[PDB]
């Protein structure tokens, strides 16, 4: 009861504790907000999952979250936004994905020097983007992280002496796909892996832990994450993706985020909105294939550009349907509360 | 008399017929609206020209138009916009150009599965873009088609197993141009071919049929299309393009669209506006060369990005000249009526 | 006294002289406005520095400035903006950098044909961009020049028969950096060279002359230019750039412009704003590395994209700090006057 939703009672009870405890809560909420979850217990569970995946990635992501939150505080950003973790998840992703795409080994402590720096740009970028997107009542989903990490990975590249990144290359030959070597266990495993890849994690246990963290806050978010992962796998099979690429969940995490966002988070959860979420996730999968192919030419990973663009497109979509209701950004908490608010409206 | 303009009398007489006839009219108007023509007879003539070029391309383009119109209806878009074909031409182009840039043979029926899908995204995109561009009173020229087809051709690419696209590669050597092998007949033929390449068609007869379709609705549109084709050829000669590339009309169709749009369609046709149309077409030709070179690196055709960007730039241009008059978007029908409205104003 | 600032007394005394003298003043002010200086004496000193660097580049840049100013006059742009040189510096940069990146020899007079043309697009672009950026009270820093020159250099490319550009290629191997061959004299020389590279000039004397021109108008602008150059060099050393690349000042000029803009020009000069300028210059250096690496894939020089993007981001940044004050665009003259205005406010 006190653990589900966004833990409003815990927020009230902590708004008068020590500043260190409040900062820890903001960091946990920022960790959870990567998947639109404003829950500190979910953030703790996600931290446990990341520790299961890679403790070094956990260190880099936690440092990114801390630095992003501290920079948002120093820049005088909205304290309500900071307290809900809306200024820590972009830095979390920045740290995690500069650890993931580093050609150096684990515990390359020098990588903390760039991480911090490009975690400091995440609040700035957010602010700048909020100067534009607020004029359309749009969120800045992961555009700060995407901009920052794309710029970092292009600036360093694979041949940097200090911070070399992993080699990303375009596809140059037709894959050999024989449909009799499909492994149903691996295809099923790609659903939790697809969920976990929103944090850059390929461990199936990490993805299952992330699903548990999603369910703790909002069961509808967990359901839409699983459905988005499945939609991503189906799209990958539809355009004849090699099975090895499908198994890694790199075709699903953008669709996971898109299905979470459109299906109940920023639209009111109705069956029309659920169908819109499915269509947005499919279009996001194909746009992710396109963006990955385009950005592999300059040697940069696709990130979550496709999720941001597809979700922005489907939020800017205007229909005369009363059942497709876009909630005001200030009223958006989580799909159950969003549906209740929509019913009252 | 009843066949010229936008056939307002026919629209009035059909607004009370069967829904199937109205849908056929909307599809024909969407076919014609690729070249800013809101005329069903012009759409029928364009369909005849496409049948002359390639019946398979006709099938794919017609399916794209039908799917785009049906998706716009299902999404509750403005019925006035749907009835004028403003939600069918982007899907028409999507179907036509995914047929054109398919490495498979003609009548590869499986290509209808992707076509439909990315024809369904054309209304959505339009809506999303209209949420922004309406704040500047701008049209969404072919940005839905350009976004959708660029994403599709990047997602599949040349090495896709199911839907391989044609190989697009950057230029890697200096062309050998000897100016004594210029063929004046082929240079002249490149004018109707340049007009026809707005639909992806390289048949000169198809381009002539398209010019007839333009003339049926508005002689000024036909004149500006021919002048834009000539301007594109002159620009191609100006930057020393190989004659083989010039003959294909790939340097002219963007300029055709830009000259139509700026010269009388969205500006009031005056001599100052005609000069502005010429300058916009020239800048569009050079921007098209730039965009084609840039996008060949990722293996994607240039599309009509240059026309959209150049026309948006020249519409956003603000001058103190009273003779350069930008008509309100709701008053834009065709250059003759636009000039009459401007004279009354 | 009459030579510092923006020479308001000279502007008043010249507003009633011959039109040729006024046009010469506008051209000189446009030359100076590349570095945010609205001073004709500074423009003359910059012209002297360019003559020191390369008289052919001086010819191309002067022609670009003249053509841009004349096109702005013909298009009926704001006479106050034209008289302050705000419509001549983009054309100046266009001419200078199409001369710099030309694979032909000096005094290739045919290069004046493209220069003029893409100097005519600089006002248009500015106008178009001002239709958007004015809605956020933002300047169009060098986006007209960046768009125009990127399009030109992509359209022609290295293999053009008439106007071949220099070969720009991505890095394909790890540099061999031995830190014992650092030359302190060359590292120090890279500061004035970094300042001079805003005009594409690598002569250290040209950069020193540019610093003198900056100091004549505003000592704070000169100080921030030097500090931005130093910040660019420090960033280049931070990401292990080969010393040969560092010595050319190609890592500093974007940071020079960013430090000038944020540190006193469009923000009120306080110590908080000076720190913000340092951070913006650092982020601009890294974004410049990223953009250069990305655009070398399509064979295009980075230009000043990074400066424009970083400065726009840091201007759109919203803080609750009263000491970080964004001046209204109409009140922006130069850092000393800006600080006085901020103190009165």
From Swiss-Prot, chains A, B, C:
TM spans (from-to): 56-75, 81-101, 109-129, 138-158, 177-196, 207-227, 251-271, 275-295, 297-317
Annotated S-S bridges: none
Superkingdom of origin: Eukaryota
Family listed: Belongs to the urea transporter family.
Protein name: Urea transporter 2
Source species: Homo sapiens
Parent-protein residues present: 96 to 440 of 920
